[PDB]
Amino acid sequence: XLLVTAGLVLA
Amino acid sequence: KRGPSVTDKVFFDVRIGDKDVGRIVIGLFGNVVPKTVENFVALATGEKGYGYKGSIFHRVIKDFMIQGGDFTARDGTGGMSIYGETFPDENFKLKHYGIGWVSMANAGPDTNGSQFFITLTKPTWLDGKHVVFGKVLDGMTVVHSIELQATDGHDRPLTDCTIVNSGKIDVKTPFVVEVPDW
Incomplete structure (x- = not known):
């Protein structure tokens, strides 16, 4: 989907 | 009239491959989030010996955002x-x-x-x-x-979008960025 993460990027 | 004030600015000179496409200037709200701004400014000037110069935008999603700042693992x-x-x-x-x-x-x-x-x-x-x-x-x-x-x-x-130069620009007098409720 639309997140902004650092390491495990999700949907 | 009403909004947070820009207290500091940071620039990023960007190259996509080997074509210099120009500068991004970012106004920072130092009175609202002082510690987060001080961090970003320090990393843009490189004054602690490491920072954003030479790092790339590593995750780019159309109509959503561009993401960068990973200068250690890239x-x-x-x-x-x-x-x-x-x-x-x-x-x-x-x-x-x-x-x-x-x-x-x-x-x-x-x-x-x-x-x-x-x-x-x-x-x-x-x-x-x-x-x-x-x-x-x-x-x-x-x-x-x-x-x-x-x-x-x-x-x-598939072509590196690199911050080839970064730094700060001082703001002599803070100015407001109008936002809805403040």
Whole structure:
């Protein structure tokens, strides 16, 4: 989907 | 009239491959989120001996945002703050009000390091989860040039979009950026 993460990027 | 004041500015000179496409200037809200701004400024000047010069925008998603700031692993797993590997979420006073606001990427609560994103939409689903601390004042054409780059299967541009130079510009008198409720 639309997140902004650092390491495990999700949907 | 009413809004937060820009207290500091940071510039990023960008090259996509070997074509210099121009400068992004970001206004920072130092009175609202002082620790988060001091971090970003220090990393842009390189005054602690490490920082954003030579780092790339590693995750670019059309109509959503561009993400950068991983100067240690360059893939999205690293980066680091001037306060240690992570620092707490300072506050969530600012919202991701619209296009061109700048916020901290993280891996859950209180894991801010050096990675950040510039919005290309109004991502209300992110409000209250990511600390907002700045807004692009000049160079959105440069941000859209990065956005239009073809990416691989992990949304990384197939041609490096590099911050070839970065630094600060002093603001002699703070000025307001109008926002809805303040």
